[PDB]
Design an enzyme around this catalytic site. Structure first.
Site: not given
Ligand code: HEM
Ligand code: HEM
Ligand code: QJ7
Ligand code: QJ7
Ligand code: H4B
Ligand code: H4B
Ligand code: ZN
Lengths: 405, 406
Positions: B110, B113, B282, B287
């Site tokens: 991720c 973070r 979000w 992506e």
């Protein structure tokens, strides 16, 4: 255990069994993966013997003469030479095999489809900086070949127990000066500041351009390195311009045709070759993206974006990405126009994919460094992004080595 | 230097040592012989539980600065007693909140973070039917979506119990488009979702035939066949995609949903395993614009868009893929912006992750990070993460993958 390797674009699966032939530990342990690290933290008869038996076995297998007479008499020679000198020497044909195998095995190289086509210059009969220079000029002229580039390596004398190494101080045979300015900034190429400053220390008169080709500092064993200026007609360069963007040319950008690494060590059958410069041809992202657009390299993005009149004020206009694409296109176009060999990152990675398949049938695996193999723009737009890769160390190998100074 | 991995940033020339990795009580897939850091999935209670539990409880007390205290040792005794007699134990409310945040904090894949400290944790450990899971999920989506101003949230359903079956959400995300297998062998919609589409149908969903049909939820309470639930369309915020200057791009009818909500991951805390615990944030614009739209095995729109852009698609060296992907990415950002839906571009995001690295260096002495996943899939070396070395290793609490329930 043999790792299962999947392509995510196609759902295809293989198993890497080649990795079982690694005899040298990498940096990862089960507690933590260190695979995105550039360098290793790290940096006697019985063991030289076994690497030497292994390698000779590799060579006789390769020419399909395993367990023949010639094979056994060759293991005897090596056994006998180590046993009394603590070292041995390679036959020219064996060296040729090792050099191509060392490329074959290089995990950070996306060009390995070419691995079988390597012009090998034997320069193990070199005893001076002067000679090295001669050999290096012939390598350059041969590899350059009027724009029709051809892979080559030149292998200088192996390291020896008693004495200094043969070395080329430069990291590449062609590199641009980087001049540290009074106000902290850099004129030219920030990556070559130190090597620029070493050349001045050994009596080179510097220029002041952003694209001054460096001289070579060549060192024969235990001697002060010597300065040689390359003749300008030997270093083919490519003026940068853009297909449609007219002002781009005005920028004065240029790059050299020949990517020739000169500071890595070649290891074959336990023997080490501290000076063994090698070259192929460029993949355009190496110049378009990294050399020109890295912020610690020529850092040209803002300049280009402004020229394109892009909104510089925010990340979300994607001006960075827009400018980078044109700078890569300008590099491809310019190389194509000046009839000098170049490969784009789609064609390159597509053929890397072919190579993976070839190696899978030939050897049962291919060691590959995913972070280095996937290109620096458009990763997921290329097929290698979607390909899992096992990374490990096979011999013959190219290794990094300390800088001589 | 110290015997901890040295970690270098090649742009700035700065060095750190990761000591956090010392706390890892779980092996990943690499060994000295071969690195496997690029595989998505490598590979595949009693006394074990207790020491996993003790470890977690020790983390909790440190985070509140009460390590060694009376409340700390009593909690330890309380946890031991409970496992002594039931095989399992239960987390206090604030223990769950800590752990859930710590699992996001620990997730090497991720880039988001910097946001870890801000997470709304919905305790749904009382939930006892698939109907109720549906209510909880809907509440989550409403809260998380917040009319465009998105908010990070997780909803934690009851933990795995020994002898009773699992709570399970069958969908990999809360919001996903259908993929319909055709006769010509192509897929309409999202090919990622072909299996879950065919399972929705087998369980009595009446299917659509669009490229962007929102799937229903297949929800499984303990020891029951899963039950089907249709999200009310007013709860699924979507953004129609347009481009700021290329007027024809709106004519393509491309769209994407606002809420990325992973629903098939296992949240492990202190040995306890929460098999249903969907979380959401979000999007980072790559992506959608680069992976979901341009992957060859997803919507695969690159060629179509390049043709509209009148690029030369018969040769790699025109960089037609590169130019079209850029535009699709600009279109994702432009359209989320216009629609007042939170999104972050890959530059803004990676920068904020470098800040997060520096925060964690000080706080914990390092940060587990998966380089191949942190580096965005366009423009890699144009972002600072490309130039940052990263150490990857497994810490608990953790989100982990788990076998699909069927
Ligand atoms: C045929 C043309 C070739 C192409 C297009 C090519 C492509 C590349 C690229 C893009 C890289 C990464 C460079 C970087 O990011 O700095 C690389 C690395 C490398 N290549 Fe090649 N290569 C070619 C030929 C060769 C040859 C002839 C050799 C050796 C004989 C070689 C050996 C290596 C090695 C050892 C590396 C890793 C270098 C390092 O760690 O800095 N390649 N290659
Ligand atoms: C706040 C906005 C957030 C952003 C921009 C973000 C960003 C991302 C991105 C870009 C990925 C990679 C996606 C992929 O390639 O499939 C990802 C993965 C992940 N994120 Fe986040 N994140 C955010 C919030 C969250 C939250 C709230 C959680 C959980 C509490 C979370 C936990 C995870 C986990 C566990 C993964 C790995 C998923 C997998 O391996 O399939 N992130 N994040
Ligand atoms: C053979 C070849 C073909 C081709 N297309 N491109 C290349 C370029 O290879 C390199 C370019 N620039 C730098 C390097 C060497 N980098 C080594 C990493 C390193 C190690 C230690 C110190 C350091 F500063 C950097 C290789 C080589
Ligand atoms: C919370 C969150 C925020 C944000 N911005 N983005 C996300 C997106 O996360 C995902 C997107 N798409 C797919 C996934 C799931 N990845 C699973 C990989 C995988 C494939 C196959 C088997 C397996 F065990 C694991 C996650 C999640
Ligand atoms: C830190 C990171 O590993 C480093 O930036 C690597 C990433 N990938 C690379 N890939 C290539 N081909 N060349 C590089 O110099 C790098 N740099
Ligand atoms: C093979 C490789 O591991 C795989 O394609 C990874 C690469 N990096 C990724 N990074 C992110 N964020 N998401 C992904 O799905 C992937 N895919
Ligand atoms: Zn590894």
């Amino acid at each position: 255990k043999f790792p299962r390797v999947k392509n995510w674009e196609l759902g295809s699966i293989t198993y890497d069994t080649l990795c079982a032939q690694s005899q040298q530990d990498g940096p990862c342990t089960p507690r933590r993966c260190l695979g995105s690290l550039v360098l290793p933290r790290k940096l006697p008869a019985e063991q030289l013997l076994s690497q030497a038996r292994d390698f000779i076995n590799q060579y006789y297998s390769s020419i399909k003469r395993s367990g023949s007479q010639a094979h056994e008499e060759r293991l005897q020679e090596v056994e006998a030479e180590v046993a009394s000198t603590g070292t041995y020497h390679l036959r020219e044909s064996e060296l040729v095999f090792g050099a191509k195998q060392a490329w074959r095995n290089a995990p950070r190289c996306v060009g390995r489809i070419q691995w079988g086509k390597l012009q090998v210059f034997d320069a193990r009969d070199c005893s001076s900086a002067q000679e090295m220079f001669t050999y290096i000029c012939n390598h350059i002229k041969y590899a350059t070949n009027r724009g029709n580039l051809r892979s080559a390596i030149t292998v200088f004398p192996q390291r020896a127990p008693g004495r200094g190494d043969f070395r080329i101080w430069n990291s590449q045979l062609v590199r641009y000066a980087g001049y540290r300015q009074q106000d902290g900034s850099v004129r030219g190429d920030p990556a070559n500041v130190e090597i620029t400053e070493l050349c001045i220390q050994h009596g080179w008169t510097p220029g002041n351009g952003r694209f001054d080709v460096l001289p070579l500092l060549l060192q024969a064993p235990d001697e002060a390195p010597e300065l040689f200026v390359l003749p300008p007609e030997l270093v083919l360069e490519v003026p940068l311009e853009h297909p449609t963007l007219e002002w781009f040319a005005a920028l004065g950008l240029r790059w050299y045709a020949l990517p020739a690494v000169s500071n890595m060590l070649l290891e074959i059958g336990g023997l080490e070759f501290s000076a063994a410069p090698f070259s192929g041809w460029y993949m355009s992202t190496e110049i378009g993206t990294r050399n020109l657009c890295d912020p610690h390299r020529y850092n040209i993005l803002e300049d280009v974006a402004v020229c394109m009149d892009l909104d510089t004020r925010t990340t979300s206009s994607l001006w960075k990405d827009k400018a980078a694409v044109e700078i890569n296109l300008a590099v491809l176009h310019s190389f194509q126009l000046a009839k000098v060999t170049i490969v784009d990152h789609h064609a390159a990675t597509v053929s890397f994919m072919k190579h993976l398949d070839n190696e899978q049938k030939a050897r049962g695996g291919c060691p590959a460094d995913w972070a280095w193999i996937v290109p620096p723009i458009s990763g997921s737009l290329t097929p290698v992004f979607h390909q899992e890769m096992v990374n490990y160390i096979l011999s013959p190998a190219f290794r990094y080595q300390p800088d001589p100074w």
